Write a protein that binds this ligand. Structure first.
Ligand SMILES: CCCCCCCC(=O)N[C@@H]1CCCCNC1=O
Ligand SMILES: CCCCCCCC(=O)N[C@@H]1CCCCNC1=O
Lengths: 250, 249
């Protein structure tokens, strides 16, 4: 440990603190992932690769780890500045590029765990997971459900998100969230708030991106940091088709 | 504005308008510095922050500060951070410790308050008492490592005094022991929470309780939601009820 991680004691012993220091994490996408990166860095994960090709837009400022001065800059450049001002000795490696079928494997290679925060409009969201399973790299899928944070982990030998994808039609986050609500309702725990926002979003006249709130981003960042700690320290986790849902209502 | 574009459906324009000016008083810029950013990005642009401490190294594992902030007043550092997120936001700071003499005037003028005050200061319980008198509900956020804990003292309800015993001093360990005992009594024991309580008590040296970034980030989300519910007059649980949020729900 260090005096920076002084208040981590009892929860983490010194050997765990050292372990997560160099534990190579791959983060694909610096949007929702920028909140996760700060929470995970402050926890003690100092070896983070961030890959994103987008620039900071105004609409990011309601839930992503950027400032007014960052607007029009590569998200990856801004989040590295933010992260390295929190920990100057941290090993924060960025790549201002979009992932494609040709480059995605070499980026994945060398990491012990990955966070798939990739827009489903790019080409590689599902292929990203397939390579990680092939390489024994578990994949965290964090989602911003407004009031809730949702994480599901694709484990190397388990079901992938394909299981809920339909053969022949495209797959996005609305499918994931509709699976979660149906699963919760199946078990007698309907999330009526979640079903309500899905209904409003689908019956929107105009075709827009899903709404997201700072609440869910902040909650999911904490969830991911806990999950990462469990994965690095070989504590048990729930794998997809099971998931973690956290909200004030719960 | 386009800054709140992705807030749609969850909030209508009139709610976004309402919380913009909803005056929040935040006592304590430690765990409160995480809460402040999440609430500002949500759309709460009228925040008063009162704290007398400086930024220390040990804050960096869970609080909203940088290596450059160390040795600076928390309120100046957190205001710089907040104003870099929103230049037009109304962030009023006071680098002062709260005392019996000043605490009422700070509370005056706010619709809701967040009590994140160290229990070694003079006014943690008096702060709530004054807020109760003035119809100001008070959020008490706690960092339970893996969990976020919030309880709201409502003006006409029980205060934290009810779990204090008149003969010994009262701190956050009493709140957490209350929460864990409540959970076990009602059939959902939090063995993780009891475990960290047990480890901390049997520590040789007397140190401050450990805290993690996860609970800070989770408690910041919970507080922002609770603020939105209070401001838009949606139902919330008041103390002796509470909200506990963790990876397992
Ligand atoms: C109808 C309302 C619920 C919509 C749920 C979207 C939440 C979310 O997280 N979506 C994406 C998915 C791509 C990678 C991660 N980041 C994102 O922003
Ligand atoms: C034994 C382990 C559990 C200890 C719980 C401490 C959590 C916490 O919140 N403590 C303080 C209390 C003062 C106001 C808010 N901020 C704080 O840091």
């Amino acid at each position: 440990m260090k005096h920076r991680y002084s208040r981590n004691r009892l929860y983490l012993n010194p050997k765990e603190q050292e372990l997560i220091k160099d534990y190579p994490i791959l983060l694909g996408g610096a949007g929702i992932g920028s909140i996760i990166a700060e929470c995970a860095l402050r926890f003690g994960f100092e070896n983070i690769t961030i890959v994103d090709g987008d620039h900071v837009e105004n609409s990011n400022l309601n839930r992503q780890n950027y400032t007014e001065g960052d607007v029009s800059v590569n998200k990856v450049e801004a989040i590295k500045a933010r992260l390295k001002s929190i920990n100057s000795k941290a090993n924060i490696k960025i790549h201002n590029c979009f992932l494609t079928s040709d480059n995605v494997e070499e980026y994945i290679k060398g990491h012990k765990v990955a966070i798939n925060a990739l827009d489903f409009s790019s080409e590689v969201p599902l292929l990203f997971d397939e390579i990680c399973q092939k390489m024994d790299i578990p994949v965290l899928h964090p989602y911003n459900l407004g009031w809730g944070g949702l994480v599901t982990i694709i484990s190397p030998k388990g079901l992938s998100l394909n299981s809920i994808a339909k053969k022949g039609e495209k797959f996005n986050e609305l499918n994931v969230v509709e699976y979660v609500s149906s699963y919760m309702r199946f078990w007698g725990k309907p999330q009526e708030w979640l079903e309500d926002i899905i209904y409003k979003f689908k019956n929107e006249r105009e075709k827009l991106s899903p709404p997201q709130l700072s609440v869910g981003s902040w909650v999911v960042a904490g969830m991911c940091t806990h999950i990462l700690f469990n994965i690095a320290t070989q504590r048990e986790i729930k794998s997809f088709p099971e998931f973690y849902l956290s909200s004030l209502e719960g």
